[PDB]
Design a protein around this nucleic acid. Structure first.
Ligand SMILES: [Mg+2]
Ligand SMILES: [Mg+2]
Ligand SMILES: [Mg+2]
Ligand SMILES: [Mg+2]
Ligand SMILES: [Mg+2]
Ligand SMILES: [Mg+2]
Ligand SMILES: [Mg+2]
Ligand SMILES: [Mg+2]
Ligand SMILES: [Mg+2]
Ligand SMILES: [Mg+2]
Ligand SMILES: [Mg+2]
Ligand SMILES: [Mg+2]
Ligand SMILES: [Mg+2]
Lengths: 143, 65, 206, 141, 63, 101, 67, 313
RNA sequence: UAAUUGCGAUAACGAACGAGACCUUAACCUACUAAAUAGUGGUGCUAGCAUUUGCUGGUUAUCCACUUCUUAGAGGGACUA
RNA sequence: GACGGAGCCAGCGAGUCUAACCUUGGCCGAGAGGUCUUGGUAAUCUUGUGAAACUCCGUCGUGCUGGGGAUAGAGCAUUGUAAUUAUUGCUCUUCAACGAGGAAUUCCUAGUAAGCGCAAGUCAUCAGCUUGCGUUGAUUACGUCCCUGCCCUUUGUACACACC
């Protein structure tokens, strides 16, 4: 009786949407997905190599639903972290804009996000629809 | 205090003589009673106006109109 | 039981338990008594608390720490050393895990275990300093009950810290086994070892 | 129509604006259920008001909280106030004084002040030290 | 062991060179007329219960 | 009949206040809608520097503050009335700017 | 601590000296009285005047004072 | 006249008490806890009345409250220079009078619920209509106006309403509002004055002050009758309407007196505990019921209570 | 007493600077004035799911209403009641 | 506890006119950064400064180890007329002491200490610095004159550049 991604938990929903995007597979990932560190503030590549890009896609799709319009700068600021500069103190350094834009335009070529005026990217019709249906199946996953 | 920032005017002047320069510090505290704007007194004076007295018994009566 | 179902879930487990009795997470706050005298009115186990994180002002006046419930004091003493000065949400998880381990090791009430541990490791007789020209002496002096409770909690947490600095065992396990042995003093707790050395040095220096 | 009241809850920098209206009985923060806020162990801290007084007294109220400023603990301790003051304000404005009063007795019997906010504010930092009271280490030698 | 449960009546003064040891007048919770002075290390109010294992030292000012 | 915006600012609060009182007074005896003034956040110009002219002594710092107060009012008035407001209301220190749009 | 200074003491003594019948036993009424019959320039100072004036009123009702 | 149970719910000195003639089961209390609480009476051994509604909206202490006869319009005069008119149900402000330059002392509505009068600290009395038009401004008092009280005229709602007022320059003024001039002035008070009230028939004034003498004046013949020491600071004054008595809340307790003939009725003492003899809680407010069977007394320990007229034995 | 801060005593009396008072800031105001350069609610248009009312959103010339939160200005409040 | 994912929240402020500042958004690039535009003389735009510590789920595992990141080599960029005794930034590789610190000694009584980052200042570029700000937020006193000193009174003095 009324379902939303706000009404479903975050981690669970993100795992289930990552598993759905794994089961579909139409994401056309770039060739350098194993190379990258996802930020210059990292030092090791992501551990779960087979699904880190799809988890990033799930998180970005949820973010676009939650907000009005954001860009690659906002995504890099969010997915950045603390850079270990050695003996010097930590700083906040932005994430990898290349993989952020690759996952953004991959969600575009699926049809989940599109170009929003005054700049930006906003959630689509079928994108809001399929995020809401998988929010449903995560709500009624109870036995 | 802010009373010094309100009422006191200070001036500094360098005077050149045949020896080294002389420093004149002039400080003038204005009276409060002849001020035209702002407070008229220092924030310490509690000036109390005197009352007037009336006879108590008064022969209690009424007036007709 | 009369549950009221809304479109917001409000699950039945928290519904039933915390409508019936004002608990911990799921732990009864009644039927706990301080087994010994001289620590009542200070070991605050008469007013219940959901979660030890409270924004209560206790350091303003003189004995509001005595008015404070004891589990928050356990978290606040789990808090020390400069790596972890600030992370009392983390300290609350450690404490929840510790009391879970207490329940697994022994079926009795974990708050009763904490009370018994504090009671059995409060150092009854300390030793103070006297000028004493020459060897600069020490004289045995008894301990006020709030200082008993404070030194008890400090001994427990320092023992857990140093026994789980570089080990496989985690802070929750080390604190739980120290609390178990302090509840049953078996000459194995660092807290009761420091208590015993304090008592023997006091009875020597008196 | 829409018999609603607006209340607030503050901690150090968090402002939580609670809209409290007569409805079906739902309780939501930032468009999401209370059962989904993420301070992890402070899920019970939010429930504290709802629980203490009793779910019954909320079985006819819709409250929606919009939250700004301050870190996560500041966020949660503010919801607590709003879903308790909005409660106290609603029972003031619409129902019996004995009911509002006995809610006040329960709240002040158990309180982490709840209805009143904390007057503790971050004092300003002074020169000669990285902290507000602590000063730089001097050497003498 | 001769454990003794005392109960304060009065606070006399804060002795000790560094000023941390407080003098108290205590009774013993079985005789009303049996009262002595004690040195205490911690903070002490009126109406609290102290623990002694030895009750006849009768100490005085610390230097 | 033109809809314009008048924005005043200064550093001295009291003369800014009676400038604004004069403006709202004159608009109120010649009403246009009501347009009470809107009060912006005060801009605190903070400049911190050392007390010492040389580099000797205890390290004592000082913070000078300038306070910028800024208000705006909307008017929808004809030509000569816009004028007579803008040349009659004028005091030292308060800088007032008028914009057509 | 809360020791009151010569300004508030001297002022309150003058007020209770020359305004006894009009002045009351309540702080709120007494501070409205002080606001109306004294041209004091500070709000906190006025509150201090009224508080010490109320203290002297209670002591006068209790018994005769030397001041 | 025995205690019928104590009444709590406030955190300030209970400055004003009032009732409703149309609905005699209702009480309104205005106190120094910055709120006005309306209560429904029950008649219980202890809790004589239960609070049913609490009204807020002031930024300072409220001093006076006045009701219309049936109990639908309620005015309050509060020391944030505010007058405000509530209803009784659902608690919303019908209107707010502002315009007074200082604290407001007393408000009164006429018998036909059309004329509202407010005397206040800026040495003046505003008279307003119901909607919020300042009908007139009246001066004359060189000092604090203590209180105002309306006086209704003869039957069939004759084309005049009278008013009386007391001000702290030893002055009492009786005015008529048909074309706004002065008609009577009363002198004779030894000291400060705080409280007067007017007869239910509308021709007697009783007035009272600091040192315990009560004067009574008559407007029909415009003459003074007498004066009567209470030996203490009298605070509040009330008329027992049908039975025609004089209740006076004073600094030690209650003094209720009789008019026909001149005899003291009762020096009413409340039992207290825990207080020394030098800190006895005095009186603040009195009110009589619609038919005057009950006087409610509000006291400085945030406590109202009630004593009902009953045969002495 | 934080304080030659006061009570008092008194060959001293009456004063002055300093302290305090003062000023700024942080706290309270569902009391005033307001405000698409801060918001909120409703109304239109529109998107999902549920559809049975609803829930989550978006929307500048869609207006309307308000100032609780945000800003200020004028005040109030604590004076150890 | 390190790492890897996700969750995800501040406040103080600064910013271009005859200049070229803060930069959104789109695209290229592993990254740093580059390019095409846009908004802002500023409660409007940068900016909800989506900060970090934290929270959750996972990898590791008492191993100087995935702790630690000094010292080195190679390359790619930016600022600048000019970077060679590396301006800085990024990438890969090298992976040292350090296993909680002796005599001593500093600061601190509540939103304080401590942890955590951010803004501004100097600034073409360069923070491990300072000045402010917010986030998370303990313990232990509520005293004493023992050490170090301070104020008042009395007292002694062969001191007055005054106990050096
Ligand atoms: Mg991250
Ligand atoms: Mg660090
Ligand atoms: Mg700090
Ligand atoms: Mg809409
Ligand atoms: Mg991490
Ligand atoms: Mg912000
Ligand atoms: Mg490493
Ligand atoms: Mg810089
Ligand atoms: Mg350089
Ligand atoms: Mg430098
Ligand atoms: Mg000698
Ligand atoms: Mg000599
Ligand atoms: Mg020598």
């Amino acid at each position: 009786p009324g379902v939303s991604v706000r009404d479903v938990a975050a981690q669970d929903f993100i795992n289930a949407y990552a598993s759905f995007l794994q089961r579909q597979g139409k994401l056309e990932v770039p060739g350098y997905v194993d190379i990258v560190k996802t930020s210059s503030g990292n030092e090791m590549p992501p551990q779960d190599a087979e699904g880190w890009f799809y988890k990033r896609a799930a998180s970005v799709a949820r973010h676009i639903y939650m907000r009005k319009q954001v860009g690659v700068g906002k995504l890099n600021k969010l997915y950045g972290g603390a850079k270990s500069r050695g003996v010097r103190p930590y700083k906040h350094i932005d994430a990898s804009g290349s993989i952020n834009r690759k996952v953004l335009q991959a969600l575009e070529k699926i049809g989940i996000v599109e170009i929003s005026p005054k700049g930006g990217r906003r959630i689509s019709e079928n994108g809001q629809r399929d995020l809401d249906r998988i929010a449903a199946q995560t709500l009624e996953e109870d036995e | 205090g802010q009373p010094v920032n309100d009422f006191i005017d200070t001036a500094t002047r360098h005077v050149l003589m045949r020896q080294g320069v002389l420093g004149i510090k002039v400080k003038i505290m204005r009276d409060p009673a002849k001020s035209r704007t702002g407070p008229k007194a220092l924030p310490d004076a509690v000036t109390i106006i005197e009352p007037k007295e009336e006879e108590p018994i008064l022969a209690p009566s009424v007036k007709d109109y | 039981f009369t549950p009221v179902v809304l479109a917001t879930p409000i699950p039945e487990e928290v519904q039933q338990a915390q409508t019936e009795i004002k608990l911990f997470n799921k732990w009864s706050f009644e039927e706990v008594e301080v087994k010994d005298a001289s620590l009542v009115d200070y070991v605050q186990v008469r007013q219940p608390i959901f979660v030890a994180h409270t924004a209560g002002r206790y350091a303003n006046k003189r004995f509001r720490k005595a008015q404070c419930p004891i589990i928050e004091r356990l978290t606040n003493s789990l808090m020390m050393n400069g790596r972890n000065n600030g992370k009392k949400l983390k300290a609350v998880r450690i404490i929840k895990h510790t009391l879970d381990i207490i329940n697994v090791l022994t079926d009795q009430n974990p708050i009763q275990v904490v009370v018994d541990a504090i009671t059995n490791t409060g150092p009854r007789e300390d030793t103070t300093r006297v000028g004493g020209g020459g060897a600069a002496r020490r004289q045995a002096v008894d301990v006020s009950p709030l200082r008993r409770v404070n030194q008890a909690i400090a001994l427990l947490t320092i023992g857990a810290r140093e026994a789980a600095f570089r080990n496989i065992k985690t802070i929750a396990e080390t604190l739980a086994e120290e609390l178990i042995n302090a509840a049953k003093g078996s000459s194995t707790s660092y807290a009761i070892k420091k208590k015993d050395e304090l008592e023997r040095v006091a009875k020597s220096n008196r | 129509a829409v018999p609603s009241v607006q209340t607030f809850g503050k901690k150090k920098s968090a402002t939580a604006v609670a809209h409290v209206k007569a409805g079906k009985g739902l309780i939501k923060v930032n468009g999401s259920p209370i059962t989904l806020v993420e301070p992890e162990i402070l899920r019970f801290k939010v429930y504290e008001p709802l629980l203490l007084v009793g779910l019954d007294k909320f079985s006819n109220i819709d409250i929606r909280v919009r939250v700004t400023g301050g870190g996560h603990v500041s966020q949660v301790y503010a919801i607590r106030q709003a879903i308790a003051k909005g409660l106290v304000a609603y029972h003031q404005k619409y129902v019996d004084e004995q009911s509002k009063n006995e809610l006040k007795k329960a709240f002040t019997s158990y309180d982490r002040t709840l209805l009143i906010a904390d007057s503790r504010r971050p004092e300003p930092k002074k020169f000669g030290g990285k902290g507000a009271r602590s000063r730089f280490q001097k050497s003498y030698r | 062991t001769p454990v003794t449960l005392a109960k304060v009546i009065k606070v006399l003064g804060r002795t000790g060179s560094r000023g941390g040891v407080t003098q108290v007048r205590v009774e013993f919770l079985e005789d009303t007329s049996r009262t002595i002075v004690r040195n205490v290390k911690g903070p002490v109010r009126e109406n609290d219960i102290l623990v002694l294992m030895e009750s006849e030292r009768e100490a005085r000012r610390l230097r | 009949i033109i809809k314009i915006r008048i924005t005043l600012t200064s550093t001295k609060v009291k003369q800014l206040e009676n400038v604004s009182s004069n403006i709202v007074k004159n608009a109120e005896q010649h009403n246009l809608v009501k347009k009470g003034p809107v009060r912006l956040p005060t801009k605190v110009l903070k400049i911190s520097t050392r007390k010492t002219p040389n580099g000797e002594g205890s390290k004592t710092w000082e913070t000078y503050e300038m306070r910028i107060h800024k208000r705006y009012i909307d008017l929808e008035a004809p030509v000569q009335i816009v004028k007579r407001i803008t040349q009659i209301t004028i005091e030292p220190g308060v800088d007032v700017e008028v914009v057509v749009a | 601590g809360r020791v009151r200074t010569k300004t508030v003491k001297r002022a309150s003594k003058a007020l209770i000296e020359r305004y006894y019948p009009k002045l009351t036993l309540d702080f709120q009424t007494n501070k409205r009285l002080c606001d109306e019959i004294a041209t004091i320039q500070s709000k906190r100072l006025r509150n201090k005047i009224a508080g010490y004036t109320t203290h002297l009123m209670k002591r006068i009702q209790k018994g005769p004072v030397r001041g | 006249l025995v205690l019928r149970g104590t009444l709590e719910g406030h955190n300030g000195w209970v400055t004003s008490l009032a009732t409703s003639a149309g609905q005699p089961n209702l009480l309104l209390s205005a106190s120094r806890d910055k709120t006005l609480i309306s209560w429904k009476l029950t008649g219980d051994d202890q809790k004589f009345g239960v609070p049913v509604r609490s009204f807020k909206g002031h930024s300072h202490i409220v001093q006076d409250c006045t009701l219309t006869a049936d109990g639908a319009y309620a005015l309050s005069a509060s020391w944030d220079k505010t007058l405000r008119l509530w209803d009784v149900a659902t608690g919303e402000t019908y209107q707010r009078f502002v315009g007074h330059k200082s604290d407001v002392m007393s408000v009164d509505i006429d018998k036909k619920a059309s004329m509202i009068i407010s005397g206040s600290r800026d040495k003046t009395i505003k008279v307003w209509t119901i909607k919020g038009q300042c009908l007139a401004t009246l001066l004359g008092h060189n000092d604090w106006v203590s209180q105002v009280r309306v006086v209704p005229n003869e039957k069939a709602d004759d084309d005049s309403v009278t008013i009386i007022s007391a001000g702290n320059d030893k002055m009492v003024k009786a005015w008529n509002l048909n074309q706004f001039q002065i008609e009577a002035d009363f002198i004779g008070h030894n000291s400060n004055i705080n409280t007067l009230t007017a007869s239910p028939d509308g021709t007697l004034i009783a007035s009272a002050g600091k040192d315990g003498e009560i004067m009574l004046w008559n407007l029909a013949a415009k003459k003074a009758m007498y004066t009567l020491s209470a030996q203490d600071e009298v605070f509040s004054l009330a008329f027992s309407p049908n039975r025609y008595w004089l209740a006076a809340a004073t600094a030690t307790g209650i003094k209720v007196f009789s008019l026909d003939p001149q005899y003291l009725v009762d020096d009413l003492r409340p039992e207290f505990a825990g207080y020394s003899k030098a800190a006895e809680p005095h009186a603040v407010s009195l009110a009589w019921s619609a038919d005057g069977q009950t006087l409610f007394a509000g006291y400085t320990d945030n406590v109202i209570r009630v004593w009902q007229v009953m045969t002495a034995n």
